[PDB]
Amino acid sequence: GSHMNPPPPETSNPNKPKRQTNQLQYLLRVVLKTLWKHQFAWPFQQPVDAVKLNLPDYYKIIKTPMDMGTIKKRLENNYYWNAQECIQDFNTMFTNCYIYNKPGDDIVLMAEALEKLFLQKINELPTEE
Ligand SMILES: Cn1cc(Br)cc(N)c1=O
């Protein structure tokens, strides 16, 4: 894509130690699955293309970009060590949305719908085996 967008967040790095936990499996099989398929998922399924969306200040404001495309790749490619790292990525995606966009903008209502499902699922994050 455009050189004016940053490189996406890292999804592969052999230097970072990896593990596959029952909680990370839940995060892919329940949490990501639930949000990915939601009618409102599409703005969150890949990094923000600030060029295409004509948001030139997006990456001036948002210095910790995250999206569900990146999280899906992280989960499928076993990038994470623990559930907290993955939960932190989802919370970053939501907070970035609420910081950048005006409250009650469509994008905000979409994030809110996903976040509601997210909280319900995360309260049921299984005990670590
Ligand atoms: C996350 N997200 C996605 C799209 Br599309 C447009 C935005 N303003 C945004 O914040």
From Swiss-Prot:
Ubiquitously expressed. The record marks 101 as: Acetylated histone binding. Residues 19-125 form the Bromo domain. Changing residue 106 to G: Found in a patient with a neurodevelopmental syndrome; uncertain significance. It is found in: Nucleus; Chromosome. Signal peptide: none annotated. Disulfide bonds: none annotated. There is a cross-link at residue 60 (Glycyl lysine isopeptide (Lys-Gly) (interchain with G-Cter in SUMO2)). The NET domain mediates interaction with a number of chromatin proteins involved in transcription regulation (NSD3, JMJD6, CHD4, GLTSCR1 and ATAD5). The C-terminal (CTD) region mediates interaction and recruitment of CDK9 and CCNT1 subunits of the P-TEFb complex. It is also required for maintenance of higher-order chromatin structure. Belongs to the BET family. Chromatin reader protein that recognizes and binds acetylated histones and plays a key role in transmission of epigenetic memory across cell divisions and transcription regulation. Remains associated with acetylated chromatin throughout the entire cell cycle and provides epigenetic memory for postmitotic G1 gene transcription by preserving acetylated chromatin status and maintaining high-order chromatin structure. During interphase, plays a key role in regulating the transcription of signal-inducible genes by associating with the P-TEFb complex and recruiting it to promoters. JQ1, a thieno-triazolo-1,4-diazepine derivative, and I-BET, a benzodiazepine derivative, have been tested on tumors with success. Treatment with GSK1210151A (I-BET151, a I-BET derivative) has strong effets on mixed lineage leukemia and promotes myeloid differentiation and leukemia stem-cell depletion. This is Bromodomain-containing protein 4. It comes from Homo sapiens. The lineage of its organism: Eukaryota, Metazoa, Chordata, Craniata, Vertebrata. The gene is BRD4.
